Symmetry: C5
Subunit: 239 residues, 5 copies
C-alpha cells in the first residue's frame, strides 16, 4: 500500500511535460545503461528529439582526460512502466566529433542496410533468443507474462514465447521488422526484461544460442549474448 | 503491489495485436501442455486460425529423428487470466503428413460423431468429474469459486459444483454442449483449473470416477482421468 | 494480490448465465448446508425456479437405501459475495413423494400462517439473536460491520447491532417482516455470517436466548439456537 | 485483500435504507460510546430522527432496578467510515421522565446559550485540544492526516493540526462554530480519532490543557480532558 | 488494506474547504519544517494567502521571552501527498516587526534580484544537487521514480535525474526558472523527497557539490547542503 499509490500519477492532466529515458549500450559490450531526462512535449519522431551526452570514463569506453560521449536518438517507443505518455528512446554512442565509438557497432550496420540492394530486398529478421531465470517443456510464469504484455505494449514486434525442457529457462521470438529496426528491437526488448525482473528480484542470464531467420523479396515472390547488429548485417552481406 | 500492476494492462487501446495460447494433450496421455503465440488481429472463427508446429520428441510422442508435430485449431474460447480479447485455442496433435498421432484420440471420435445418425440424434452429454486439492458434504472455497467464475467467463458450459463428504474434494459438472464439443470442453475446463491452482500453490489430483450421462432426440421426444472422447464415442456407438 | 483479481469478474458482460446457491437446513436440525447450481437467466420469482435434488444419507436425514431428498425454491435474495446478478435461494427439505421431511419444521408453520385469521392479523415478528466470536456494553468490529452491510445488501430486514458487557459478543436485531418471511430471513441472515466469518478465520458460536417481539393488527389499531419457525408459529394462534 | 472488499459496498444503489450510529457520553464522564441502528431513509434534520434509548445499568449511570436511559438526537454529520449516505448522530442522555441525566451536562449549557443576550452576542469558540499516541516542534503522520481528512469530510469545523516538541504528541484546533455547536463538535471529533486509531492499533491519551478562545459580536465590531460544555458555558456566563 | 482506504478521500465533493501546509526553514539553517492549517477556499496567488505565525523558541531562532516568529506566503504549489486541490506553501521567516530573521536569507536575495539590471538580464539558474539513501552509473529506483513524478506533479521545474558510480547515490537537476524562483524551487523540491522517503523508511543525506549553472539575456542573444539563495545571489552580483 505504501509508496505504490505514487508511481502511477496521471501527470498528463496536471503538466504537459514528459520524461524521456535515454538507453545506450555499455562500454563492456555486454552491458546496457540508461538515465533519465525531461522534455517539454512528447516526441514520437526521433529526428525532433534533441541529442544529449554523458560521461563515458566511468563506463569504460573513453579515458578520463576525454570522457564526454555523445548520444543521438534512434528509436522511440512507449514506456511500459510509467504508463502515461512517457517514452523510452534507444540511442547509440558516439565519441566527440561525430565518429562512431568502437563499441557502437550500429553505424556500420546502418550504412550496410542503407545500400540500395538491401533496401530493395527489404529483409525480414527474427532472432530466437533464449534466457534463464536464477535466484539472487511448455516457475514464475507471472514474470514472463508481464514481460510479454509489456513488450507488446511498447511496440516491440515480439511474436511469441514458450517453455522449454531445461528447468525454468524460456525463449521468446521477435517478429519480422523492417530492416535494421529488427536488431534494434531485440536490444530494446532485452532492456525491458531486466526492469521487470528488477521488480521481482530475479537474475536474468542470457549466457549461451540465437537462431537467426532471414528472408528477402528475391525469394518470397549465433550466440544469445551477441549483438544482433553483427549477425543481422553479416547475414545480409553474405546473402 | 509489485508486479501485479502489470499483467492487467489493457493492450487493446495501444495495439490491435492479440495473444493466442496453443493448448494440446501431452504425449503421456494424462499430461496437458501449452505455449504461446501472437496474432495480428483477434479471430473467433477456428477455420481462419493458421496451423502451427512444435517439437514432439521432448514431449514423449516422437522418437527424436522425426520430432516435429503439427497442430490444427479446433476450439476458440476467451482467456480468463489475460482478459481483454486474448483467446485460448484448443488444438489436437498430428504427426507429419496429416495422419492423427497415436495419442490424439480425437480424429476417430470426430469421424464417429460425423455419422448422419449421430448428428440426427443430436446427443447431449454431461460428464461428472471429481477432483481433490492437496498441499504442495457441501477448505479453500476461493479456489473453487474462482474456477467456477473463470469457466463461465471462458465459455465452458459448466452447470454446477458441490462439496462432498471426503475432506476437501469437490466435483463439477459440464452441461449439454452440442455433441463432441462436450468432450472438448471437459479437457479445456480441466486446463483452467491447474492455472488457477498454480496461482495459489495447491496440487490438483484427478486420480480415481466420472459418470457419463447421454441423451438424444430419439428418447427425449468411467474414470475421472479418462479421455472424454473415448467415453463419449464408445457410448454413442453402443446406443 | 494473487487469486483475488478473480472472484470479482463482471460475468454479466460476457455471459447472461447466473449461479444460484441452493440453501437448506442440515439433518442435525441446527446445521445449515448449501451447494451451487447454474441457471440460464436470473429469476427473482421463487415460483419460476425449478425444484432440485440431493443426497440425504450423507447429511443424516434419510437411510442409505432411500437417500434422495427433494428441494423446492422458497426465498430469493441477492448474493453479497458474488456481487453480480448472482442470487442465493433458501429452500426447504422434502422426502420423496411430496411429504415434508421430519427436520423441515416449515410446512406446518406455513399452513398455520395460511389461516385467514393469521393473514388478517398480519403479524410482525422481530427475533433478537445473540452470538459470540471465538478464536479458531456498546474485537473484530470490521467483521460485524461487514455483516451488517452485507445483510442490508442482500435484502435481510436487519435493524441495528451493539456490543454488550461480555467481551466480544454482539447481537443483531431483525426488523418486522411480513409474516413467516421474518423467520425465513433469520435463517438466511444466519448463513451469511458464517461465510463472512469464513473469510476471516473466526468461530461463530450461537450457544445460549432469543427474544421474540409479537404484534398484529388487533393491538396496533426462546433460545438463540432454536428454529425461528417454531417460536414464530408457537407464539401465534396463542395470543 | 480478504474482508476488505466488503465494507465498501455502495448500498445506496441496492437499498434506500441507511444505517445510523447513535453516540452518547458514557456514564463515567470521560468515555464516549455508541451503538448502531437502521433508518428507512436518510434524514439531515435532527428533529425528524426518532427518540430512542438503551440499558444504562451496565453503563454505571442508573441502578439495576431503573436502568433505561432515554436518548434524543442532537447533531447530524456524515460518517467517515461507512461512506456514502450513512450518518453519525450525536445524542445526549436523559433520565426517564424528561429530566437530564446527571452525566448529561448539556441541558444547562443549552439553556444558558438560549438566553437572548448570548445569542445576540453570537459567541465563537476555539478549543485547543492536544493528545498523545502510545503503543498498545514542527511518528505515524498517516494517522493524523487521516484524522484531518475524515474530520473535514464529516463536518467537524477543525482548522488545523501541528507537531510539537514532545515526541509524537500533536494538537488540533477546532474552528469557531455557531454557539454550543462548537462544544458539540469537539466531542464528536474525539470519537472519530479512536475509530481511526482503532484501525491502526494505537492508544490515544488525552490526559493533561484545552485552551479556550472566546469572541462575540460586542468586541469584534481548561483541561484537555474536560467537557467542552462546562468551559464553553462557564466562560459565556463570566463574560 | 487498513488505514490506506483513508488519506485519499475526495474531500472536494463534500466540502469546499482546503488544507494548506506552511513550510519554513528551520532555525538550525539546515533543517526544513512545516505544519498544517485550513482555508475556506483554495489559494493560488501568494498575495491572497493571509500571513500566519508560530513559536520560534522551540525552533532555536528566538529566545523564550520573545519567541513568536511571523510568516508571509511566498510560493504556492500543488500537493502530491494529498492530491485534489490541496496545496503546499513555502514561506520565509521574519522576527516580529517586519524585519527578516537572521536565518531567513530570503529578503536580501529578493532585494538583489529586484535590481533593474538583474531583472533585465533575466537570469536562468540550474542547481545540480546530489543525495544518498541510507538504511535507518546511470537500489530502490521506486523511491527516485516516485520523487521525480511528484516533483513534476507539484510544479517544480526539475529537468532529470541519473544514477552514479558510488553505490546508491543519485543526483537531480532542476531546470532554469525565472529568477529567484529557481532557488526557491530547490528548497521546496528537497522537502518533497523527505516525505516520500518518510513513506519508505530510508534516510536521505545531502552531505557533499551543488553545481551552479548561470545564464542571462546578455550572453544568450557550491556545496549541496548550501542555501540556493546565497549562491544564486552571490553569482548574480559577481556577474
Amino acid at each position: 500500500s505504501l509508496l505504490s499509490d505514487l508511481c502511477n500519477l496521471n501527470l498528463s492532466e496536471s503538466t504537459e511535460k514528459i520524461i524521456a529515458e535515454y538507453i545506450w549500450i555499455g562500454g563492456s559490450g555486454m552491458d546496457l545503461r540508461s538515465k533519465a531526462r525531461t522534455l517539454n512535449a512528447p516526441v514520437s519522431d526521433p529526428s525532433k528529439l534533441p541529442q544529449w551526452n554523458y560521461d563515458g570514463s566511468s563506463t569504460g569506453q573513453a579515458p578520463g582526460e576525454d570522457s564526454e560521449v555523445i548520444l543521438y536518438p534512434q528509436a522511440i517507443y512507449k514506456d511500459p512502466f510509467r504508463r502515461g505518455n512517457n517514452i523510452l528512446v534507444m540511442c547509440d554512442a558516439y565519441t566527440p566529433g561525430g565518429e562512431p565509438i568502437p563499441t557502437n557497432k550500429r553505424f556500420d550496420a546502418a550504412k550496410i542496410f542503407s545500400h540500395p540492394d538491401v533496401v530493395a530486398e527489404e529483409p525480414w529478421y527474427g532472432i530466437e533468443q533464449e534466457y534463464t531465470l536464477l535466484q539472487k517443456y511448455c516457475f514464475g510464469r507471472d514474470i514472463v507474462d508481464a514481460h510479454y504484455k509489456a513488450c507488446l505494449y511498447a511496440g516491440i514486434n515480439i511474436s511469441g514465447i514458450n517453455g522449454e525442457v531445461m528447468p525454468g529457462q524460456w525463449e521468446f521470438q521477435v517478429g519480422p521488422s523492417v530492416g535494421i529496426s529488427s536488431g534494434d528491437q531485440l536490444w530494446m526488448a532485452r532492456y525491458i526484461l531486466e526492469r521487470i525482473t528488477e521488480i521481482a528480484g530475479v537474475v536474468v542470464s542470457f549466457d549461451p544460442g540465437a537462431h537467426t531467420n532471414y528472408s528477402t523479396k528475391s525469394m518470397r515472390s549465433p550466440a544469445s549474448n551477441m549483438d544482433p547488429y553483427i549477425v543481422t548485417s553479416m547475414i545480409a552481406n553474405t546473402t
